């Protein structure tokens, strides 16, 4: 089997890229952010306090003739940036693009943190990370990936990001139209539940690339580019103007600004991020600083390949005994 759904960006900065999942008989369809980040599929629901709910579309499993409450599962999740949800849990029909699994963990959230309120236009997430990382207690669940992957063509899916545009996720297949050149395939740690990889360094616009290894994961559901500190700092020292901001979080530039392109290497490929995709726009609203998509890692722990990355590339996630990802530009 095969699955092909197109996911498109909640606002015009690319913040984050929806898709939409069928869950339940007859379909509910919710719009998910597929994170291959983490490794829970968690929903707005029937059940979550009412006053956390603010627009987003609901899952209600009484509704469905196919839910079945988990007896006795609960999740509870952190992700990064310091939001949270938790629940109890169902099993349920889940399609997406067309591709179905029977009985998948759907984890009805009743409380969400209040950047998931107030963002109407995300219904809930899909993880798409190593399954080791499910929240769900006392018996932790698998991922839509990992149980679709048997019935699948291949144990793989792929995400095709749009720059300011929808893109494609696929399960079970490689679209040989979808990207230039070849595919180059780069070895993965699973170790600390991720799609961990490492980049063999990076050119900040014209200049020379600089051969280092930098270990990062490739994660749908962060939206920028967080990198070493060294890095960072010599991509906006060829930005007139830009400086980091404690106040506001990192790195910020003037509007005016012309932004140079940032590489990356894949092992003896190049992937190349065009400037406008490092642009995420005024501070505020009427500001003439500017966020910008390249931040430091340094308070993080972890380097992170989020969406201004991974939107330049054409991306494999090889779910193959041994896990390997691929990068092709497009």
Not at 75 to 92: A, E, H, L, R
Not at 100 to 127: C, H, M, N, R
Not at 159 to 184: C, E, K
């Amino acid at each position: 089997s095969t699955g092909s759904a197109t996911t498109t960006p909640i606002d015009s900065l690319d913040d984050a890229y929806i898709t939409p999942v069928q869950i339940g008989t007859p379909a509910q369809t919710l719009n998910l952010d597929f994170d291959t980040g983490s490794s829970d599929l968690w929903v707005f629901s029937s059940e979550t306090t009412a006053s956390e709910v603010d627009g987003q579309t609901i899952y209600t499993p009484s509704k469905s003739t196919t839910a079945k409450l988990l007896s006795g599962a609960t999740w509870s999740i952190s992700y990064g940036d310091g939001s949270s949800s938790s629940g109890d849990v169902y099993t349920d029909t889940v399609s997406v693009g067309g591709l179905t699994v029977t009985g998948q963990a759907v984890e009805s959230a009743k409380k969400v943190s209040s950047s998931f309120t107030e963002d109407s236009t995300i219904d809930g997430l899909l993880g798409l990370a190593f399954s080791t990382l499910n929240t769900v207690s006392p018996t932790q669940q698998k991922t839509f990936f990992d149980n679709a992957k048997a019935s699948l063509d291949s144990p793989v899916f792929t995400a095709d990001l749009g720059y300011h545009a929808p893109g494609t996720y696929n399960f079970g297949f490689i679209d040989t139209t979808a990207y230039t050149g070849s595919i180059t395939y780069t070895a993965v740690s699973t170790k600390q539940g991720f799609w961990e990889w490492t980049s063999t360094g990076y050119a900040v616009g014209s200049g020379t690339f600089k051969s280092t290894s930098i270990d990062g994961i490739a994660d749908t559901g962060t939206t920028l580019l967080y990198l070493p500190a060294t890095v960072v700092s010599a991509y906006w020292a060829q930005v007139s103007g830009a400086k980091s901001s404690s106040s506001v979080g990192g790195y910020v530039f003037p509007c005016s600004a012309t932004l140079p392109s940032f590489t990356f290497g894949v092992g003896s490929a190049r992937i190349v991020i065009p400037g406008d995709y490092i642009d995420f726009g005024p501070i505020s609203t009427g500001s003439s600083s500017c966020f910008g998509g390249i931040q430091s890692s340094a308070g993080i722990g972890i380097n992170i390949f989020g969406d201004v990355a991974l939107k330049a590339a054409f991306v494999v996630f090889n779910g193959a005994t041994t896990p390997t990802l691929g990068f092709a530009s497009k």
